[PDB]
Design an enzyme around this catalytic site. Structure first.
Site, mmCIF file in Angstrom:
data_model
loop_
_atom_site.group_PDB
_atom_site.id
_atom_site.type_symbol
_atom_site.label_atom_id
_atom_site.label_comp_id
_atom_site.label_asym_id
_atom_site.label_seq_id
_atom_site.Cartn_x
_atom_site.Cartn_y
_atom_site.Cartn_z
ATOM 1 N N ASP B 383 -17.237 13.253 -20.893
ATOM 2 C CA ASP B 383 -15.954 13.209 -21.575
ATOM 3 C C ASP B 383 -15.104 12.149 -20.903
ATOM 4 O OD1 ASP B 383 -13.296 13.482 -22.355
ATOM 5 O OD2 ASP B 383 -13.418 15.637 -22.582
ATOM 6 N N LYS B 384 -14.474 11.289 -21.690
ATOM 7 C CA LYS B 384 -13.801 10.142 -21.104
ATOM 8 C C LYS B 384 -12.610 10.550 -20.258
ATOM 9 C CE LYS B 384 -10.960 7.622 -22.933
ATOM 10 N NZ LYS B 384 -9.491 7.559 -22.834
ATOM 11 N N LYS B 516 4.590 14.180 -32.454
ATOM 12 C CA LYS B 516 3.888 13.152 -31.704
ATOM 13 C C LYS B 516 2.402 13.400 -31.853
ATOM 14 C CE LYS B 516 3.219 15.119 -27.146
ATOM 15 N NZ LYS B 516 1.814 15.292 -27.607
ATOM 16 N N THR B 627 -16.098 11.083 -26.351
ATOM 17 C CA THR B 627 -14.688 11.233 -26.048
ATOM 18 C C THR B 627 -13.932 11.641 -27.294
ATOM 19 O OG1 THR B 627 -12.672 10.018 -25.609
ATOM 20 C CG2 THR B 627 -14.584 8.754 -26.260
ATOM 21 N N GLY B 628 -12.644 11.867 -27.131
ATOM 22 C CA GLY B 628 -11.806 12.158 -28.267
ATOM 23 C C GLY B 628 -10.732 11.110 -28.408
ATOM 24 N N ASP B 629 -10.713 10.160 -27.485
ATOM 25 C CA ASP B 629 -9.669 9.156 -27.468
ATOM 26 C C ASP B 629 -10.018 8.018 -28.417
ATOM 27 O OD1 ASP B 629 -7.190 8.219 -26.635
ATOM 28 O OD2 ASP B 629 -8.053 7.038 -25.016
ATOM 29 N N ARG B 726 -13.213 9.232 -30.953
ATOM 30 C CA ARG B 726 -12.553 10.149 -31.875
ATOM 31 C C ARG B 726 -13.445 11.326 -32.252
ATOM 32 N NH1 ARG B 726 -8.113 9.672 -30.558
ATOM 33 N NH2 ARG B 726 -6.548 8.234 -31.386
ATOM 34 N N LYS B 732 -18.756 17.108 -30.505
ATOM 35 C CA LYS B 732 -19.281 16.932 -29.163
ATOM 36 C C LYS B 732 -20.510 17.791 -28.930
ATOM 37 C CE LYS B 732 -15.145 15.539 -26.755
ATOM 38 N NZ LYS B 732 -13.792 16.012 -26.422
ATOM 39 N N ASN B 756 -11.772 20.934 -24.815
ATOM 40 C CA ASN B 756 -12.631 20.337 -25.826
ATOM 41 C C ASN B 756 -14.091 20.416 -25.417
ATOM 42 O OD1 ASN B 756 -9.969 19.576 -25.962
ATOM 43 N ND2 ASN B 756 -10.418 17.623 -26.954
HETATM 44 N N1 LIG Z 1 0.194 16.538 -25.806
HETATM 45 C C1 LIG Z 1 -0.241 15.823 -26.833
HETATM 46 N N2 LIG Z 1 0.555 15.676 -27.913
HETATM 47 C C2 LIG Z 1 0.092 14.973 -28.948
HETATM 48 N N3 LIG Z 1 -1.081 14.378 -29.110
HETATM 49 C C3 LIG Z 1 -1.852 14.551 -28.029
HETATM 50 C C4 LIG Z 1 -1.517 15.239 -26.884
HETATM 51 N N4 LIG Z 1 -2.561 15.212 -25.975
HETATM 52 C C5 LIG Z 1 -3.493 14.526 -26.583
HETATM 53 N N5 LIG Z 1 -3.123 14.078 -27.826
HETATM 54 C C6 LIG Z 1 -3.931 13.342 -28.789
HETATM 55 O O1 LIG Z 1 -5.145 14.041 -28.956
HETATM 56 C C7 LIG Z 1 -6.262 13.173 -28.658
HETATM 57 C C8 LIG Z 1 -7.400 13.977 -28.079
HETATM 58 O O2 LIG Z 1 -6.984 14.602 -26.863
HETATM 59 P P1 LIG Z 1 -8.108 15.492 -26.175
HETATM 60 O O3 LIG Z 1 -8.829 16.253 -27.232
HETATM 61 O O4 LIG Z 1 -7.526 16.204 -25.002
HETATM 62 O O5 LIG Z 1 -9.079 14.351 -25.633
HETATM 63 P P2 LIG Z 1 -8.750 13.105 -24.694
HETATM 64 O O6 LIG Z 1 -7.661 13.600 -23.794
HETATM 65 O O7 LIG Z 1 -10.027 12.808 -23.964
HETATM 66 O O8 LIG Z 1 -8.307 11.988 -25.582
HETATM 67 C C9 LIG Z 1 -5.655 12.092 -27.768
HETATM 68 O O9 LIG Z 1 -6.391 10.880 -27.795
HETATM 69 C C10 LIG Z 1 -4.282 11.913 -28.403
HETATM 70 O O10 LIG Z 1 -4.390 11.096 -29.542
HETATM 71 F F1 ALF Z 2 -10.799 13.533 -22.251
HETATM 72 AL AL1 ALF Z 2 -11.631 14.443 -23.541
HETATM 73 F F2 ALF Z 2 -12.494 15.308 -24.849
HETATM 74 F F3 ALF Z 2 -11.831 12.912 -24.430
HETATM 75 F F4 ALF Z 2 -11.444 15.973 -22.618
HETATM 76 MG MG LIG Z 3 -16.847 16.513 -18.035
#
Ligand SMILES: Nc1ncnc2c1ncn2[C@@H]1O[C@H](COP(=O)(O)OP(=O)(O)O)[C@@H](O)[C@H]1O
Ligand code: ALF
Ligand SMILES: [Mg+2]
Ligand SMILES: *[C@@H]1O[C@H](CO)[C@@H](O[C@@H]2O[C@H](CO)[C@@H](O)[C@H](O[C@H]3O[C@H](CO)[C@@H](O)[C@H](O)[C@@H]3O)[C@H]2NC(C)=O)[C@H](O)[C@H]1NC(C)=O
Ligand SMILES: CC(=O)N[C@@H]1[C@@H](O)[C@H](O)[C@@H](CO)O[C@H]1O
Ligand SMILES: *[C@@H]1O[C@H](CO)[C@@H](O)[C@H](O)[C@H]1NC(C)=O
Ligand SMILES: [Mg+2]
Lengths: 324, 1028
Positions: B383-384, B516, B627-629, B726, B732, B756
């Protein structure tokens, strides 16, 4: 924080042998050079052991003993002529061999009663049930019960020398001291108490095939029964079908004369024991013993082959590397 | 859907507060442990053998098969029975602790085992919770309590839980005043974080003010209460139903590929045993044909034995050969491979190289069965953000109305208010001495480090968030003007939607919905005219490696807000799938929002997050980043980590080149079947998305002339670099599922630090959880848990390598030593009337496994490093690539089996050729068949011990001890058993066999030479490897 001791951290003090060429070739060479000398001393000690074996079973129409190969008047008497070309030097040991005789047969090894041969008065008068078909007969318990004690080798071999005359000089054979010291002085005792040995063997019989009781196997009370060394020696199983058991030992005469001078000898057999049935052989073996036992080349040839294959590999390796 | 009534007074169906974590009882320990042991292929086999020995008449005594089993069975039974008396002791301590209950204006002091659903428990300070409460009140107002689940999920932060409003008026006095309630709650789920409920507080006359519960009220069971006065709860789940007690089921992953090779080896040795027995019977009746080969007059059968049916004899002789050759199958393999895994599970948590000075914790081993599946991994799914890059977010370069604010006085103010609201930061209430810092202590303690960064980046400018004053929110707006707000709704964030939102009410007027989210999930619903202007800055910020969040807002009207009021409270007041019925509601509350701006947050890679992905690419693994980013943020982090090297041709299946249902397949097949199969490690790397992976997998049920998923997996397997941007928390796991299946069993690993990544950490063969800035949610679903990514290198390379090598060379050798045992006894049957006569004594047959050869291999499998554990981590290039299960394959298995056959042949036929002598002493005395068996056994014991002494490359004092002491115990037991062991025996068969066998120089030389000839084919490989 985590327990930082030698053991939990997988870093105990260790040796870790490094195996590198200059640490791995001198091995081949050392074992080669330590074996070939051993495998030559042994080979020589063996080949210097004089032995002769006479197969006196009969079965050869021309053989002297074919007159009792068949079931004949109980006391047969044959004699065979052998010749000792090269005199026997040390003290000599006379064995008797047997082929196709499986003393190592499950049903046959089971067939003793150690508690009885060990003098246990309780097991004397009621032998075990492992010695089965030979455990009771004539509504009594058999003294040396079992198959092992019943099928005991029982023909008498004697040796004679033929001097400058033809008269036979009777070679003197010795019976005492042919069985493991322990299992004649410990593992085999006579029934507990009494003065004459026929009283102790009171409510017992003699095995089926024998001819005299156990208490009449020898005249010296120190070799009489359950202690008779020939009995004790028959009772230690062979481990292979073709075996041989120490029969007599001829002790070197304190004079400067060999034990068995060269010349011509009679081996006369009171042929009693029948082996014609199960297709066996009977042999008398006169041999001389070394620091290593008897004539057997396996140890010598095997040491030499191992120490001349290790050396060949060591040479191939020194060539390969120090030339490459 | 259970319906509790608070005081148990009206307006039994439920369990009792007693947890039982143990397995057994005092009355079904045996009946339950024995059945579960004797269910194993070899325990059942030896029980069968013991019964066949006790009923039939057989070659070998019954002790030789039931003493080695009554021991291997009573050792495991003692181990497990104690390891469960521990659980009994612990359960007793937990649920025999006093807990006061407000029965009826009476503060009784019952025991935690006598609490029943729906009775007001009263918990003092620092007192753990007796059962899943629901905080109905406290002493202090503001109705909040601080709970620290230092034991449930490992965490150590003081989370804060909220009371039920209508009830905080009840405090210590007539709270038993028939406070009419009806706490409708979902059925117990082990989720440990979710909870769906509803209250029905009644008034004196008529009231139904029900505050929908959640995981904000449920004070879990066994979670200490910290820094408060005292709380009143109404127990809802009562032990064995409360999550803390429902999470006792966590085993069913621990199944390695070195527990199925044990069974393949067992099956082969059973079909070797049957062939030995069948050959020996076929030849026992082709030998007994001759009339004088059965009962030849020296041994004559017994009447009974003679008049027994024939076929019955063929059956009984087959049975006696299976009961003679029955040791070809190891009796002590199970107890040794279990004591080894027990005593060696620790090394991977005692290690002080997994110790984070910050978290003040090390590694954690939640399953000691995969220990040897770390040294076998083939794929690694990471996970990134969180693992490759720790959540130290530094806010940089906001972007208001596409202006890069660093718009005069119209909307900047709104953007900064947005940044300050629309989160859940929750500054630590108390603040330290002010004057040494910039503003104050004001330690923003949130759970999402993306919000903390935005509040700190607004503070860099005018605004400063300081609020949450019991329903309000306060912010300094570039002037010291607190400017109270009012949080009406918090449309919380979920990984799938990617938008957090808040519905505040201005101090003196209207409402405002701030939102946001990610750009992908916030541009779809905005005033499209501003997307084309803000997306360019979003794209720059992304391509430079920054996390980008878009900030939007909406002005809500009264009637529309009064409609959303119902639409939102009816989603929480509903017991049935409220999470889904609420996603579907505030997913249409966020429809057309005026985009305000965007914000970029820079994040850094962990300590060695690049020198570990290099160490993993070197050792052969294929590291995928799920990743989810974003796609360029993830891609920049991947280029930093050295996942993608400089000269790599990237294959983008993203949404930048695949905006067409059919135009995807074009590339899907063109860049595989004509491109990457016709045309590297540094050249090819794939970059996929979530929507595109869905397009591939989900609706690939129509076009199957060349399967979509198939061509795609083909594209993937030719790339050691793949980046899945994404990706949602369920895709995942779709990916690990896809991979667990292809072209064999690629042993996957999956390492995550968030919520996640709790899905793949559960899907994949061995899951690793990191313990970082988010929480300990994955560290507890995972098999191992390390507080850093860089610890994965040491874990795999230098712990899986050793854990796998030790057990593979325990398994091979356990069968080697027994084929060596039993080949002499099979060959002896020819030089026997095939009469199944044991070659070896009985003491030897029992002891070989449990005394003479048991320890050395255990000490080896525990304390042994065939490559020093320092060079192991210093060199991955191969040392790990060297054993892709290779150490337990057919090749090595047959090498070992042929070596054991060679050694058994040498033992037997060297003693055979030595016994052609007429004497081996110098007094000319002859040796029986017990001295033949003890010679073969001496050679056997020493050759197997020294084949292990030639394998150990790491000689601790314990190796010296066990090896040379196993040899000296063979030699001392044999003299002790030779001497007086008389009275209780029926045999006296080995009375001096050893002490006479050793009085012959010839037998000494023969034993030395046969040990050497037997170890030669091994001292030869040593040298052929040391050379070249
Ligand atoms: N607190 C937050 N409020 C709004 N959007 C968020 C927040 N945290 C994360 N995100 C959005 O959700 C996406 C996925 O977050 P997450 O599933 O934790 O994976 P990662 O942190 O690896 O990107 C982020 O790339 C961002 O676009
Ligand atoms: F930082 Al991740 F899923 F992208 F926890
Ligand atoms: Mg890990
Ligand atoms: C030397 O040993 C041989 C063989 O071991 C002895 O031969 C057996 O001796 C008994 C009597 O002592 C024989 O009767 C026995 O014969 C068997 O069958 C007969 C009838 O046919 C029956 O009476 C017996 O019970 C027995 O089953 C002999 N067995 C053979 C020949 O194999 C021999 O007597 C011994 N000679 C001595 C001690 O001088
Ligand atoms: C007595 C003697 O010494 N010689 C014997 C002779 O009697 C016979 C012959 C049989 O081949 O064997 C020799
Ligand atoms: C020895 O064998 C010879 C052969 O004739 C015989 O004369 C002699 O009597 C035998 N031994 C005995 C029994 O005296
Ligand atoms: Mg996140």
């Amino acid at each position: 924080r985590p327990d930082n001791t030698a053991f939990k951290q997988q870093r105990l003090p260790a040796w870790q042998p490094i195996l590198t060429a200059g640490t791995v070739l001198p091995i081949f060479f050392i074992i080669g050079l330590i074996f070939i000398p051993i495998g030559i001393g042994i080979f020589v000690t063996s080949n210097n052991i004089r032995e002769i074996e006479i197969d006196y079973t009969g079965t050869e129409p021309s053989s002297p003993c074919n007159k009792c190969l068949s079931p004949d008047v109980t006391p047969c008497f044959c004699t065979i002529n052998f010749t000792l070309e090269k005199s026997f030097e040390g003290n000599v040991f006379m064995y008797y061999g047997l082929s196709n005789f499986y003393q190592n047969h499950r049903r046959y090894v089971k067939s003793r009663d150690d508690s009885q041969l060990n003098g246990d008065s309780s097991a004397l008068l009621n032998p075990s049930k492992e010695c089965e078909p030979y455990r009771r007969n004539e509504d009594k318990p058999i003294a040396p019960c079992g198959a092992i004690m019943n099928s005991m080798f029982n023909d008498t071999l004697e040796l004679f020398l033929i001097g400058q005359d033809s008269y036979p000089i009777p070679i003197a054979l010795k019976k005492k001291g042919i069985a493991w010291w322990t299992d004649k002085n410990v593992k085999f005792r006579n029934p507990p108490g009494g003065d004459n040995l026929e009283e102790r063997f009171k409510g017992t019989t003699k095995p089926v095939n024998w001819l005299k009781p156990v208490y009449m196997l020898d005249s010296d009370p120190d070799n009489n029964g359950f202690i008779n060394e020939d009995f004790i020696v028959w009772m230690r199983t062979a481990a292979l079908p073709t075996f041989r058991k120490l029969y007599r030992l001829i002790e070197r005469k304190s004079d400067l004369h060999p034990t068995l001078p060269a010349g011509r000898y009679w081996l006369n057999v009171t042929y009693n024991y029948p082996v014609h049935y199960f297709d066996g052989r009977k042999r008398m073996i006169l041999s001389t013993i070394s620091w290593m036992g008897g004539k057997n080349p396996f140890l010598g040839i095997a040491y030499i082959a191992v120490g001349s294959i290790s050396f060949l590999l060591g040479v191939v390796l020194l060539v390969i590397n120090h030339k490459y | 859907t259970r319906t509790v009534f608070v005081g148990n007074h009206p307006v039994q169906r439920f369990c009792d507060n007693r947890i039982v974590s143990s397995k057994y009882t005092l009355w079904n320990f045996l009946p339950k442990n024995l059945f579960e042991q004797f269910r194993r292929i070899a325990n059942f086999y030896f029980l069968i053998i013991f019964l066949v020995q006790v009923t039939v008449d057989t070659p070998t005594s019954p002790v030789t098969s039931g003493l080695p089993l009554f021991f291997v069975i009573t050792v495991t039974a003692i181990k497990q029975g104690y390891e469960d008396w521990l659980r009994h002791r612990a359960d007793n301590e937990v649920n025999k602790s006093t807990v006061y209950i407000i029965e009826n204006a009476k503060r009784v002091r019952k025991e935690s085992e006598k609490i029943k659903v729906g009775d007001v428990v009263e918990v003092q300070a620092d007192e753990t919770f007796p059962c899943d409460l629901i905080l109905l009140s406290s002493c202090t107002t503001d109705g909040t309590c601080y709970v620290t689940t230092a034991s449930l999920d490992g965490e150590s932060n003081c989370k804060t839980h909220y009371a039920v409003r209508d009830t905080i008026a009840l405090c210590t006095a007539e709270s038993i005043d028939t406070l009419r309630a009806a706490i409708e709650c979902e059925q117990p789920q082990p989720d440990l974080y979710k909870f769906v409920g509803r209250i029905n507080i009644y008034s004196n006359s008529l009231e139904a003010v029900a505050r929908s519960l959640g995981p904000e009220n449920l004070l879990l069971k066994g979670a200490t209460l910290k820094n408060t006065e005292k709380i009143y709860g109404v127990a809802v789940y009562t032990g064995m139903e409360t999550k803390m007690a429902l999470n006792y089921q966590g085993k069913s992953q621990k199944r390695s590929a070195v527990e199925k090779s044990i069974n393949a080896f067992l099956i082969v040795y059973l079909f070797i045993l049957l062939t030995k027995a069948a050959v020996c019977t076929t030849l026992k009746y082709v030998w007994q044909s001759t009339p004088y080969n059965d009962e030849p007059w020296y041994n004559q059968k017994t009447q009974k034995e003679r008049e027994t049916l024939k076929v019955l004899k063929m059956f009984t002789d087959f049975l006696s050969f299976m009961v003679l050759f029955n040791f070809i199958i190891p009796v002590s393999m199970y107890v040794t491979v279990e004591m080894q895994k027990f005593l060696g599970s620790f090394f991977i948590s005692w290690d002080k190289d997994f110790y984070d000075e910050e978290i003040n914790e090390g590694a954690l081993v939640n399953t000691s069965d995969l220990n040897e599946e770390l040294g076998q991994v083939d794929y690694v799914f990471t996970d990134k953000t969180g693992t490759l890059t720790e959540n130290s977010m530094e806010f940089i370069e906001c972007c208001i109305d596409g202006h890069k604010y660093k718009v005069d006085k119209n909307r900047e103010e709104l953007f900064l208010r947005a940044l300050c609201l629309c989160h859940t930061v929750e500054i630590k209430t108390n603040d330290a001495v002010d004057g040494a810092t910039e503003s104050a202590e004001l330690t923003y303690i949130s759970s999402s480090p993306d919000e903390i960064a935005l509040v700190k980046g607004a503070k860099r400018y005018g605004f400063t968030f300081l609020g949450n004053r019991n329903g309000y929110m306060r912010v300094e707006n570039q002037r010291k003007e607190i400017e109270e707000y009012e949080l009406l709704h918090t449309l919380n964030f979920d990984a799938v939607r990617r938008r957090m939102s808040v519905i505040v009410k201005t101090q003196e007027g209207d409402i405002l919905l701030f939102c946001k989210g990610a750009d992908s999930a916030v541009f779809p619903r905005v005033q499209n005219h501003e997307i084309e202007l803000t997306k360019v800055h979003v794209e720059r910020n992304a391509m430079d490696g920054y996390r980008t969040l878009c900030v939007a807002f909406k002005e809500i009207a009264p009637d529309d807000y009064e409609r959303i009021n119902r639409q939102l409270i009816e989603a929480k007041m509903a017991l049935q799938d409220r999470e889904e019925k609420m996603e579907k509601v505030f997913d249409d509350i966020e429809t057309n929002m005026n985009l305000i701006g965007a914000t970029a947050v820079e994040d850094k890679l962990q300590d060695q997050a690049a020198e570990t992905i290099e160490a993993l690419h070197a050792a052969g693994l294929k590291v995928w980043v799920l990743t989810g980013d974003k796609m360029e943020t993830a891609k920049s982090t991947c280029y930093a980590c050295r996942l993608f090297q400089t000269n790599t041709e990237l294959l983008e299946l993203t949404t930048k080149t695949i905006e067409e249902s059919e135009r995807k397949e074009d590339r899907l097949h063109e860049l595989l079947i004509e491109y990457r199969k016709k045309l590297e490690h540094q050249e090819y790397g794939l970059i996929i998305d979530g929507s595109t992976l869905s397009l591939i997998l989900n609706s690939s049920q129509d076009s199957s002339s060349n399967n979509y998923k198939s061509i795609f997996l083909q594209i993937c397997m030719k790339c050691t670099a793949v980046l899945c941007c994404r990706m949602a928390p369920l895709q995942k796991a779709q990916i690990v599922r896809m991979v667990k299946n292809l072209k064999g069993s690629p042993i996957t690993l999956s390492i995550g630090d968030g919520a996640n990544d709790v899905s793949m950490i559960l899907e994949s063969h061995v899951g690793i959880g990191i313990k970082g800035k988010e929480g300990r949610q994955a560290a507890r679903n995972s098999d191992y848990s390390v507080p850093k990514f860089k610890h994965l290198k040491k874990l795999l390379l230098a712990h899986g390598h050793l854990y796998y090598v030790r057990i593979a060379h325990l398994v091979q050798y356990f069968f080697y030593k027994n084929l060596c045992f039993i080949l002499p006894q099979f060959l002896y049957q020819f030089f026997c009337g095939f009469s199944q006569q044991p070659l070896y004594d009985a003491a030897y047959l029992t002891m070989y496994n449990i005394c003479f050869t048991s320890l050395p291999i255990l000490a080896y499998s525990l304390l042994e490093q065939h490559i020093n554990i320092d060079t192991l981590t210093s060199d991955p290039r191969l040392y790990m690539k060297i054993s892709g299960n290779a150490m337990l394959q057919l090749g090595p298995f047959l090498y070992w089996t042929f070596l054991a056959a060679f050694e058994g042949t040498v033992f037997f036929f060297g003693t055979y050729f030595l016994f052609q002598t007429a004497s081996l002493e110098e007094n000319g005395k002859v040796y029986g068949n017990w001295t033949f068996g003890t010679i073969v056994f001496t050679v056997l014991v020493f050759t197997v011990t020294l084949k292990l002494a030639l394998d150990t490359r790491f000689w601790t004092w314990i190796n010296h001890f066990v090896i040379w002491g196993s040899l000296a115990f063979y030699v001392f037991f044999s003299f002790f058993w030779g001497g007086i062991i008389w009275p209780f025996l029926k045999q006296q068969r080995m009375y001096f066999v050893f002490a006479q066998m050793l009085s012959s120089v010839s037998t000494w030389l023969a034993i030395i030479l046969l040990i050497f000839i037997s170890l030669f084919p091994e001292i030869l490989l040593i040298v052929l490897k040391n050379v070249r």
